[PDB]
Design an enzyme around this catalytic site. Structure first.
Site, short mmCIF file in Angstrom:
data_model
loop_
_atom_site.label_atom_id
_atom_site.label_comp_id
_atom_site.label_asym_id
_atom_site.label_seq_id
_atom_site.Cartn_x
_atom_site.Cartn_y
_atom_site.Cartn_z
N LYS A 10 0.89 -0.94 0.09
CA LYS A 10 -0.10 0.24 0.31
C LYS A 10 0.89 1.53 -0.04
O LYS A 10 2.35 1.49 -0.11
CB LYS A 10 -1.06 0.48 0.96
CG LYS A 10 -1.75 -1.00 0.72
CD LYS A 10 -2.78 -1.54 1.73
CE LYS A 10 -3.87 -2.38 1.99
NZ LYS A 10 -4.93 -2.32 3.02
N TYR A 51 -11.35 -4.40 -3.90
CA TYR A 51 -13.01 -4.03 -2.84
C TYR A 51 -13.59 -4.34 -2.95
O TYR A 51 -14.57 -3.22 -1.95
CB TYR A 51 -12.09 -2.87 -1.81
CG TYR A 51 -10.10 -2.86 -1.35
CD1 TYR A 51 -9.40 -2.41 -1.62
CD2 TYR A 51 -10.25 -3.56 -0.33
CE1 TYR A 51 -8.20 -2.23 -0.81
CE2 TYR A 51 -8.74 -4.02 -0.16
CZ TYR A 51 -8.21 -3.53 -0.48
OH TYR A 51 -6.76 -3.54 0.78
N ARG A 100 1.74 -6.42 10.02
CA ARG A 100 0.72 -4.73 10.58
C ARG A 100 1.05 -5.04 12.22
O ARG A 100 1.38 -3.48 12.59
CB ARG A 100 -0.29 -5.08 10.15
CG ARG A 100 -0.78 -5.27 8.96
CD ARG A 100 -2.45 -5.37 8.46
NE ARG A 100 -2.70 -5.36 7.37
CZ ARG A 100 -3.89 -5.46 7.28
NH1 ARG A 100 -4.73 -6.44 7.70
NH2 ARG A 100 -4.47 -5.31 5.88
N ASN A 110 -2.79 0.39 6.38
CA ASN A 110 -2.60 -0.72 7.26
C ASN A 110 -0.99 -1.42 6.08
O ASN A 110 -0.83 -3.35 6.78
CB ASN A 110 -3.16 -1.29 7.87
CG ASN A 110 -4.11 -2.02 6.51
OD1 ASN A 110 -3.49 -1.98 5.71
ND2 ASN A 110 -5.53 -2.44 6.93
N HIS A 113 -1.50 -5.66 1.53
CA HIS A 113 -2.92 -6.62 1.64
C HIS A 113 -2.58 -7.48 1.33
O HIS A 113 -1.63 -7.98 0.56
CB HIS A 113 -3.71 -5.95 0.80
CG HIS A 113 -4.93 -7.02 0.54
ND1 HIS A 113 -6.23 -6.79 0.64
CD2 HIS A 113 -4.73 -8.05 -0.48
CE1 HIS A 113 -6.52 -8.36 0.22
NE2 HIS A 113 -5.96 -8.86 -0.71
N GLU A 124 -8.72 -12.11 -7.52
CA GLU A 124 -7.25 -11.03 -6.98
C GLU A 124 -6.37 -10.44 -8.03
O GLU A 124 -5.68 -10.08 -8.73
CB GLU A 124 -7.18 -10.61 -5.25
CG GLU A 124 -8.11 -10.05 -4.68
CD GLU A 124 -7.18 -10.51 -3.44
OE1 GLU A 124 -6.63 -10.53 -2.91
OE2 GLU A 124 -8.86 -9.97 -2.40
N1 LIG Z 1 -9.92 4.25 5.09
C1 LIG Z 1 -10.62 3.00 6.06
N2 LIG Z 1 -10.15 1.60 5.69
C2 LIG Z 1 -10.44 1.15 6.19
C3 LIG Z 1 -11.47 0.51 7.04
N3 LIG Z 1 -11.74 -0.38 8.36
C4 LIG Z 1 -11.46 -1.59 7.57
N4 LIG Z 1 -10.07 -0.40 6.21
C5 LIG Z 1 -9.65 -1.40 4.87
O1 LIG Z 1 -10.46 -1.95 4.12
C6 LIG Z 1 -10.07 -3.20 4.53
C7 LIG Z 1 -11.48 -3.79 5.31
O2 LIG Z 1 -10.30 -5.23 6.19
P1 LIG Z 1 -10.92 -6.53 5.32
O3 LIG Z 1 -11.65 -6.10 4.81
O4 LIG Z 1 -10.93 -6.99 6.59
O5 LIG Z 1 -9.34 -6.64 4.75
P2 LIG Z 1 -8.30 -6.89 5.68
O6 LIG Z 1 -7.07 -5.82 6.69
O7 LIG Z 1 -6.47 -7.00 4.84
O8 LIG Z 1 -7.44 -8.01 6.68
C8 LIG Z 1 -8.74 -3.05 5.38
O9 LIG Z 1 -8.03 -3.42 5.22
C9 LIG Z 1 -7.64 -1.55 5.96
O10 LIG Z 1 -7.01 -1.56 5.03
C10 LIG Z 1 -11.62 2.11 8.13
O11 LIG Z 1 -12.74 2.32 9.22
N5 LIG Z 1 -11.09 3.30 7.08
#
Ligand SMILES: Nc1nc2c(ncn2[C@@H]2O[C@H](COP(=O)(O)OP(=O)(O)O)[C@@H](O)[C@H]2O)c(=O)[nH]1
Ligand SMILES: Nc1nc2c(ncn2[C@@H]2O[C@H](COP(=O)(O)OP(=O)(O)O)[C@@H](O)[C@H]2O)c(=O)[nH]1
Ligand SMILES: Nc1nc2c(ncn2[C@@H]2O[C@H](COP(=O)(O)OP(=O)(O)O)[C@@H](O)[C@H]2O)c(=O)[nH]1
Ligand SMILES: Nc1nc2c(ncn2[C@@H]2O[C@H](COP(=O)(O)OP(=O)(O)O)[C@@H](O)[C@H]2O)c(=O)[nH]1
Ligand SMILES: Nc1nc2c(ncn2[C@@H]2O[C@H](COP(=O)(O)OP(=O)(O)O)[C@@H](O)[C@H]2O)c(=O)[nH]1
Ligand SMILES: Nc1nc2c(ncn2[C@@H]2O[C@H](COP(=O)(O)OP(=O)(O)O)[C@@H](O)[C@H]2O)c(=O)[nH]1
Ligand SMILES: [Mg+2]
Ligand SMILES: [Mg+2]
Ligand SMILES: [Mg+2]
Ligand SMILES: [Mg+2]
Ligand SMILES: [Mg+2]
Ligand SMILES: [Mg+2]
Lengths: 132, 133, 132, 132, 132, 133
Positions: A10, A51, A100, A110, A113, A124
């Site tokens: 990222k 996404y 992370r 974070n 991915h 993907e």
């Molecule tokens: N900007 C923002 N991004 C988010 C938030 N929650 C999740 N994300 C992003 O979207 C993804 C959602 O989490 P998830 O689908 O469980 O993926 P994972 O973090 O790779 O396990 C994450 O990788 C984050 O980068 C949020 O509250 N704000």
């Protein structure tokens, strides 16, 4: 149990100069680069597909903006149990020892991915590396 | 939004063992910022006794205080999202690898680092080491 | 109190240049080397003594062939609660933060051996350092 | 014999998260911290005292503005031949192996200051630690 | 003096898992990836052009074979004085502190290529990244 | 073709300071292989005096011998292309950063590592520490 999985580095990783640090952890666990692309700025469409699961979440638009706010690297990794292992390597901002866990501190910014399943990995990989 | 402050002490064993930068580096790499910092070639024993006030009726108290004044310490206030609990996890314990204590320490008492374990402890400890609030 | 435990650095560590990396992780947790030997090739009897608890398992011969396929280093480490602590350091391939978690990806080629108990410890030390 | 020398970690080090990296390199060469202060923003007079030898150069004001654009840490280090040794550790942006050689790419934004002589050393220490 | 230069990560780097280590040193010196390609096996033509200078040297054919014996990564790096600085970072197998200095030990298997001049950089970038 | 062998000693200060793996790791990363290795909790002073025979009429000789027996040492034979001179450069000196001594040591005498400085020294030193040639 040889597998391929998809990793994105990222934009916060570039911003913070953690790109090599992140790829190093995966490399040191013995996974191999099958293919790789550098995106100085990823096409928004690609991020949106990547996404798609989240298009209804409130955070979806902030998320795309961020993914497009700097470079990303898309990588296809190969190895035994690659999907699950690299996922574990990615971890979460709560668990030290992981990517992370050691390096990230935000739920959105974070760093990395990693595909979370066999199906999401195939999906993907087709997005970022359609030439297959 | 989630921003907090927490107090960290680099303990005398970290200086004896040259792990100061190693320890601070782990915290830095997790994107926490130094907001203030003090070097104490020897910390006033009164500061220590206060810091560990909750331990004053323990078997180990006087050795603990002795250890904490046995060499330099650095007190640091760190700031970042969820800093109190995140820096706490980073500290970990000598049983869990991946953490500072897990990777670097092997003693109940000589465990290199202190981090505040809650909002109340943080406010209280920051008061102690940085009274000029 | 102090314990001593036995560690073997396996042939895959030499092959992948992780010897110093592995010994470093043990060094940083403050354990001291009491005894150490380098075997460009370990005598097979020693290996079979060492893994005698496994002599009935179907992987036994293959394990021994692996352990003999390159150099190994045998080390006696000393420190507080050494046996259990170095065991945790060792970990397994599912646990980031540990030697096997960060560096290994195979069930058998997993870089390091650490005694799992006071009994096995005392035993394994006499196997590799009978002179004592 | 022992010397003491003064080091400043500059604002670019905080910006790029290299504070611990820089202090680590000094720590590993076995120098000890005698005194240390953190300034979220250093008073400008101090900076101007510190670089008074440069007060006539055209870059003087810009240098001072930079040195005031973020936190700095001032450190008194002690060890054998400290002044000269930490100077070499510091190096310049052309010399791999040194702090500036490995980590810096700009003439002005170069991470660290180290006293260049016994005189400047004694002087710079009194500027930053007048209480002594 | 902002410049772009061309870097190749050679197959011995993959063989030895030093890819991230190498890219990390360049990243830590503050240079930026402009573009990047992964070649699981580079077209021989590309290698031949890249090393055209050498087609008369006796070692030329061994050299191409090696460059094609595993993956390479081609990278365009950008920064102040990038050509000269990254060149210095690459160094030679004699000079510790540098990439080849710390990590390489062979005149042929030396991990990294970096353009050595303004002209070779423009040439080399056009080979590996003709889309400009 | 260019393959050589050279003798390295990890000195007692490296154990005191926990730099053993750090030092061996630098040599490993440069693609040199261990061909034999011995741990000595205390090296026989006769081995030391021989190792440093060329120094027997120096002011520092008895302190040097004292230091070398003051803690553990590890003797290692390393093999690789041009190993004698390459491992020598890696050792460097306390004045040159990038090297083991340059980065990690700060003393004329407590300088962490010995490496053979020539083919003759290597054959001679390897003889001393690994007589079972
Ligand atoms: N900007 C923002 N991004 C988010 C938030 N929650 C999740 N994300 C992003 O979207 C993804 C959602 O989490 P998830 O689908 O469980 O993926 P994972 O973090 O790779 O396990 C994450 O990788 C984050 O980068 C949020 O509250 N704000
Ligand atoms: N010497 C010694 N010190 C102890 C003992 N138990 C606790 N301590 C000290 O006090 C702390 C005890 O843990 P706690 O007060 O809950 O805070 P924590 O250290 O962050 O886990 C340790 O950091 C030790 O430094 C003990 O049995 N012996
Ligand atoms: N090839 C192979 N090796 C195994 C298997 N199970 C255990 N081993 C070997 O035995 C070890 C794992 O289990 P165990 O011997 O009980 O304990 P450990 O070695 O300390 O983790 C590894 O070091 C393997 O080399 C298996 O299914 N296949
Ligand atoms: N911006 C800028 N800063 C300079 C220049 N020359 C010197 N400096 C500053 O002065 C230092 C370099 O020379 P000098 O002060 O004599 O010694 P040094 O700082 O220890 O290397 C750097 O820390 C710079 O911040 C210049 O041409 N431009
Ligand atoms: N296989 C082999 N390759 C060589 C030999 N000499 C040089 N090379 C390769 O070809 C290049 C020739 O060196 P040079 O043109 O100065 O490039 P540089 O090493 O990047 O500075 C080197 O990068 C080596 O990778 C040799 O004797 N054998
Ligand atoms: N204590 C002390 N030791 C010295 C002195 N000079 C040399 N030595 C020791 O002997 C070595 C002198 O260097 P040399 O014999 O040429 O071998 P080198 O150490 O690899 O450079 C050093 O490693 C020191 O350990 C000295 O003045 N004092
Ligand atoms: Mg997921
Ligand atoms: Mg505590
Ligand atoms: Mg077992
Ligand atoms: Mg100056
Ligand atoms: Mg050239
Ligand atoms: Mg010597």
């Amino acid at each position: 149990g040889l597998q391929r999985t998809l990793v994105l580095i990222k934009p916060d990783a570039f911003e913070r100069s953690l790109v090599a640090e992140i790829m190093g952890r995966i490399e040191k666990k013995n996974f191999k680069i099958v293919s790789m692309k550098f995106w100085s700025k990823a096409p928004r469409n690609l991020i949106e597909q990547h996404y798609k699961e989240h298009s209804e979440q409130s955070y979806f638009n902030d998320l795309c903006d961020f993914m497009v706010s700097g470079p990303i690297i898309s990588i296809v990794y190969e190895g035994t149990d690659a999907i699950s292992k690299i996922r574990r390597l990615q971890g979460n901002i709560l668990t030290p020892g992981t990517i992370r866990g050691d390096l990230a501190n935000d739920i959105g910014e974070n760093l990395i991915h990693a595909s979370d399943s066999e199906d999401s990995a195939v999906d993907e990989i087709s997005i970022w590396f359609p030439e297959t």
